[PDB]
Symmetry: C3
Subunit: 257 residues, 3 copies
Amino acid sequence: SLIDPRAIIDPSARLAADVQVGPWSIVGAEVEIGEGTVIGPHVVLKGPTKIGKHNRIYQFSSVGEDTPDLKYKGEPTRLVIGDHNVIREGVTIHRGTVQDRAETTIGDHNLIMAYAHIGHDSVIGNHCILVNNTALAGHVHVDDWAILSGYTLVHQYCRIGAHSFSGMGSAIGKDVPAYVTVFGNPAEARSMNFEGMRRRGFSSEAIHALRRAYKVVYRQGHTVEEALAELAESAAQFPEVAVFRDSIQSATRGITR
Amino acid sequence: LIDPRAIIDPSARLAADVQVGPWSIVGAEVEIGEGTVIGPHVVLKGPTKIGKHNRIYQFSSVGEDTPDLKYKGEPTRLVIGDHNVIREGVTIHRGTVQDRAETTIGDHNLIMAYAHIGHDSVIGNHCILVNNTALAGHVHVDDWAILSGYTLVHQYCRIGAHSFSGMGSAIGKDVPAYVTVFGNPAEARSMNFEGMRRRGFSSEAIHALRRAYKVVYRQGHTVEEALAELAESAAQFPEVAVFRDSIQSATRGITR
Amino acid sequence: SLIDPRAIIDPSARLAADVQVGPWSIVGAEVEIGEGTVIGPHVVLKGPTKIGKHNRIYQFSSVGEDTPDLKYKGEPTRLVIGDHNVIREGVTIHRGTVQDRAETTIGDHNLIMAYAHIGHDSVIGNHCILVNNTALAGHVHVDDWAILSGYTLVHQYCRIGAHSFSGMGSAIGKDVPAYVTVFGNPAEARSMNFEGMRRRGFSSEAIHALRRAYKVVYRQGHTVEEALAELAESAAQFPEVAVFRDSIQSATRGITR
Ligand SMILES: NC(=O)[C@H]1CN(C(=O)CSCCC(=O)O)c2ccccc2O1
Ligand SMILES: NC(=O)[C@H]1CN(C(=O)CSCCC(=O)O)c2ccccc2O1
Ligand SMILES: NC(=O)[C@H]1CN(C(=O)CSCCC(=O)O)c2ccccc2O1
Ligand SMILES: [Ca+2]
């Protein structure tokens, strides 16, 4: 059928009628798979885990394993994956811990390339790209349209802002505000992702307002609280600047400079 | 020879000699040449041609579509030559129509565990890609180059013949032939004198290349002035011609 | 003791009581597996290799392969793994070479996370943590209670001292003394793993003697020789300082500064 007979499907697994599963893949207990999803060959799915519609998961991926994190001690934690995601070769995704929200969450239209790691309790939004070997250490929040280039390392609890960009081999120990571009080990704030803003149809007015907001946070010698007070006027006028100001206000590990 | 637990597509073409391990998939339009050993748990996808006396290790994906968004299903190709070793979990992607629609690997290359050969990359002969080396795409690696563990190469970069990268090198610009580079970002340190000894280079050639490095890196010349100074040495020693041509064809700039 | 019939067990392999082997795993010739070891699915074991008791080995791991450069050709060479080790998704562990130890050795209670690499002739002690994609290039010694954060790179012949710590994406080219914390590419010494000493129940006076032993080596412009002769007395008092002194005395290839 669409389920390869060489696949192991746990009787407790729930598959929508058109789900494809390849040879030598394991669909574990308490795994749910939504309509149109294709599971390649040599995939291990472990639950409790929910996968949505029209997803593609590639060979040698381990989706829904326990974190090796020594704070995890066997409790019933979840992984939720949305719709229209692509999960490439050798990707590892772990379920959450009771210490946080007992859930790891991915939304829709994400591209997660080969040997990427999505650590316990991470939250990925929609339309994100994680290039080869991007490692999210745990409790990492990645907001919509962020792009992490190959071998980007993200420390535990870091927030990656909407429409942000990391250069290849970036080592992120602090939060990346929305729209900010970071490079290097350790990661350094260069500019804003003006290329991504134009690709996603931002107004000229919003881009100019974001250009000015960067300057207020990074280039006028303000403390963060001083910069947040200076951003208030622009943030009230433009939602993009409010997105920026909020990423800064909610950046619990401080911002990448 | 072909394990009964392997899946061979009807449209694949295997030379008589070829071994395929259990639980390996040999997909549509994959050709595998005589003496080649496909390990267990290998995924091959085409259109792909693999030459003679290759060895591909468990959990490799060789000939997959690039996930690069600019790829759209075109029947792009991967060509691998002879006598290559492809170790555990290596990813090799076919080309894109935007470039020349082909990822190309030559002969006698060693590609160690979890290395990545991005779409449209061109590898020559006798190269070593150490563990987790990543060719981002459209990367040209000339003969005898050695990239140490976790070397990242930016799209379109050229790695010169007998060049060498230290472990964790991040290469954003062309590496000239023989040049040894280290760090993130990568910087030129010296020449691969050991690679030269390994090839039985004459003391004369080794001497002239030591001079040539100084001309380019240590004597304050622009690249133009450097090329002019190298012309006589380039004419006398083919070994220096290689160095000189690698700088000539680096329209991007050279790793400093 | 569930041996999945879909695994290939070599007639020369030896399985102790309560060994589990998941489906589509290979236990090669001259592989020995000790009591209660769990081998997951899609595992490749090559010998000659001896694995002890109550280990866990995850899917896609290659344990006991040969080093890839054909210039190390030579047999037999060995891999020894002790007890209570956890080896996660897609770990590579290579046997030794006749040109050196002829053995790769791992002790007990080690955590080796996804896609870590243990190079030929490496020696790992007890209670070590190697985080995602840590690579020991070859002939690397990791002493007890060391932690290597994700994507730590270790050069051939380097020693990682007892209770030492490396920040994520460290490139270690020189010996890391016992207790010392290192960060960056290339790796630099920042401090000592005090947080680690405390949670191992080190006496406060021992911790203070190590705070002094650090300053005596790194921050007082002493030679190595000078530094050692000054710590003779403290090293006679505190076994802990002796462990620090010994890690420096036995680094003729220089220490990470
Ligand atoms: N989608 C792709 O083509 C590539 C690009 N890439 C990147 O990190 C983006 S290229 C950035 C480096 C530059 O400036 O060339 C990448 C890096 C490492 C492995 C696979 C990859 O996939
Ligand atoms: N806990 C995990 O599973 C994480 C933590 N981590 C780190 O680099 C730091 S963990 C410091 C060692 C200690 O656990 O005490 C990490 C980084 C990059 C990828 C995966 C990772 O796995
Ligand atoms: N021959 C092998 O099997 C090794 C060598 N190697 C290298 O990066 C080259 S040696 C690093 C340089 C120095 O130790 O000083 C390496 C590095 C990281 C992972 C696996 C590796 O495989
Ligand atoms: Ca700045």
